[model samples]
Target: STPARRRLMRDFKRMKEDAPPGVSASPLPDNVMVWNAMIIGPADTPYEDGTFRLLLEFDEEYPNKPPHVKFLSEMFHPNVYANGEICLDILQNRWTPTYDVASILTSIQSLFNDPNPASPANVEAATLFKDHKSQYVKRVKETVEKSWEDDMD
Candidate 1:
């Protein structure tokens, strides 16, 4: 097997053994490189009581390159784009070989609650988060409720 595939297999094994709290991920049955993940909303945050889903698509580069991760859940965050791509530091410039599936999911869960209003993918969310905190929280609450609806389906 290729180094990327082998490394991903090892990572996958470790992920199940030490799965992070509030997050879970599993590779598709037919394609080990593509993972379907879920992140439970962080407590006391706007995303509380929500269940969000995502898809992580890994390429042959493995740890050398970050996976293409996108949300399958309804998200309204400063760091999440309309197309579902997330803008996070570690997933871009700060990515390192040390990051694994568990780390990625945990990071994403944190991001959902603690967003970077300074650097945003959704301009409206950033603006609201920075200029209108109450409005931002309310908007996020809507997204969280929508997540529950999606989860039920």
Candidate 2:
């Protein structure tokens, strides 16, 4: 493993030692390069009580390239795609080597309530988030319920 991979394992250990509330993740047993993550909805947001799942695919490039982060649990947000791809700055243009697994998980959890309508991956969610308050919230609620149902198996 490269320094980046070592760093990831090191960071993983740190996260296991103590991670932030409302977010958690575990590397796949068969493949250490991929992880399954979870995020609980933040209070006072349209996503309350929701248990969202995500996948993070790490590659050899490691710190030099951001991991592919995508939702495994259905999500409806301005920055999330119909295919579960997320349009987050930190995972893309704004990424830097200083970030770790913890930082990524924290940012994603925060995204439950704070979406950037300007750089939307899902135009429908963005439009609702911008102009139609009720509709945006309704979609969020649906996704929240869907999150549970999708994991029911």
Candidate 3:
């Protein structure tokens, strides 16, 4: 487990040093295998100001196997299921040993602006994204506003 431990420490250190704006990550002291993350929506996106929380579960295999991440807060996106499962390629088919936490977070941020409807986590949201872009944006805006208010609480 030395390699896994080293990777964990290295990744955590990097995350701490160059933390993304409005984003935070905390690994369990007893178990670096588990981490909690918060991602604030990027500006100009429909998800702006939304405080999205997620859990990252790493495996003993480390970089060879990708971590499992799920949204803790409810999200209405084509690639995010009602149960919080995300359908991003990097998390699945496109995973690479070189990918790091920062890259993953960046991917998630980009996902807010460009969603893949081909393989959707939320079918209805995907349909809306494809058939009713305006309504979909409106719904996301409402969600963002609500999340902003929640952050104040």
Candidate 4:
């Protein structure tokens, strides 16, 4: 436990110092295993300018198993459910010990660009994405604009 915790702490410290553009993370002092993250929507996408929050829970067997990640904000993506659970393979079946936080975040960002219709977390969103892409794009733009006005307080 000590070795794993130490390694995680080191990784987190480095990540905090050199975070990617528009991404941030922090852990509650009392629960280092749980973290809060924010990601700014990629440019040119319908979600552009939107800031999305997520919860990441590292398990005792982390590295050996993938962390649990869920959106903390309402998002209109085919791969993200209304309740925020994501439909990403790496979070489930494809997890490997070699994975890191940077890689995980990168994968999630990519998911936004290339959603997999075969496995969707939000059925309606997926249906709209597949059947009515233009409408879906409109909804996403509206959602992103609205997110900018959300009051966290």
Q: Which candidate leads the pack in lDDT? A: 1
Instruction: Kindly give the number of clashing pairs for every candidate.
Output: 0, 0, 0, 0
lDDT of 3: 0.83
Q: Which is superior by lDDT, 2 or 4? A: 2
TM-score for each predicted model, relative to the true structure: 0.93, 0.92, 0.87, 0.88
Of models 1 and 4, which has the larger TM-score? 1
**Compared with the true structure, what per-residue lDDT tens digits does model 2 show for residues 22-134?**
88888876676898898898899999989998899999888889999998888888878998898888999999988888999998788876877577888888888889989
CA lDDT, candidate 3, residue 61: 82
- The 10 consecutive residues of candidate 3 with the worst lDDT sum are 142-151
Off by over 4 Å in 4: none
Best by TM-score: 1
Q: lDDT tens string, model 1, 1-153?
A: 698888888888987888888988999878889999999888988888788899999999989999999999889988899999998888999999989888998988888667875768999998888899999999999988998888677
lDDT of 4 by residue, 1-153 (tens): 465566578658867888766677777778778888877888878788788888899867878878889888788887898878888888889988777676677778777767565867787878888899899999888878766767455
Worst 10 residues of 4 by lDDT: 1-10
C-alpha lDDT score of every prediction, in listed order: 0.88, 0.86, 0.83, 0.79
Global lDDT of model 1 = 0.88
lDDT (Cα, tens digit) per residue for candidate 3, span 98-119 = 9877777778877886767587
CA RMSD of all predictions: 1.3, 1.4, 2.0, 1.8
What's the lDDT for residue 59 in model 2? 90
Candidate ranking (TM-score, best to worst): 1, 2, 4, 3
User: By the lDDT metric, which is better: model 2 or model 3?
Assistant: 2
